[PDB]
Design a protein around this nucleic acid. Sequence first.
DNA 1: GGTTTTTGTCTGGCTTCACACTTGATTTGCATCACTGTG
DNA 2: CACAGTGATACAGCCCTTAACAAAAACCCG
DNA 3: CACAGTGATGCAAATCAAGTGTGAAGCCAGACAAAAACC
DNA 4: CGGGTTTTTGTTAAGGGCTGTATCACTGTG
Lengths: 90, 16
Amino acid sequence: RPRQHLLSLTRRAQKHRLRELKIQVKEFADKEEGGDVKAVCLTLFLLALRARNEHRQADELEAIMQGRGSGLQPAVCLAIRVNTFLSCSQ
Amino acid sequence: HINKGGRPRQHLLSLT
DNA sequence: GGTTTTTGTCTGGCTTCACACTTGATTTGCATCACTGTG
DNA sequence: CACAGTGATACAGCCCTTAACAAAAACCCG
DNA sequence: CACAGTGATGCAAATCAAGTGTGAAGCCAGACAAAAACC
DNA sequence: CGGGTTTTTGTTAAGGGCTGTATCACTGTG
């Protein structure tokens, strides 16, 4: 049977394409980086995303992995509401 | 073996 | 039938999230009020 | 020399690949 | 029976902060074992 | 004290793609 799309695969049915890769991934992480796998994959994914010209997604991932800056201050929300010529209902 | 020196290896998340 | 893919399981051990009770202490949502503006 | 718009358009800035080389900072040991 | 505002007010609904011990869920180990679409 | 080794950062040019800003003749309260 021909293979299907990788994203459409379930959580369990996608480990047998990555079994033959995580071995060298983690041995490289041990021998060169120190042992971290999530961090080195973060670096690789940021590099791939920036090469693909998806800097918006790269910045979103950087923000979510770093301290979450989500949420605007009430003062700046009021500043936007007043300077952008907006009304309360809008 | 003799140590040849070199710059220390920082965390991969701390580089450019 | 062959071949490849796709799900299923196996037990001990680990981490990670939800809740079981209670009492307040807030934050947030939405209806109400008499009006406008284009004729 | 009022000052903050008003929106479509075009050009500049910043950044990614190729690959080989160059300038520069941190330890080791004679 | 126009309809989308217009913002302040006030009450009701929702979420949470405080205490620790549980349950409930996802995943890890490497390996074995059934369904399903093309020849 | 300074080569020697290792690691960090930048540089050269041809193209592609996203993002930011200047430019054009106008507006209104008079």
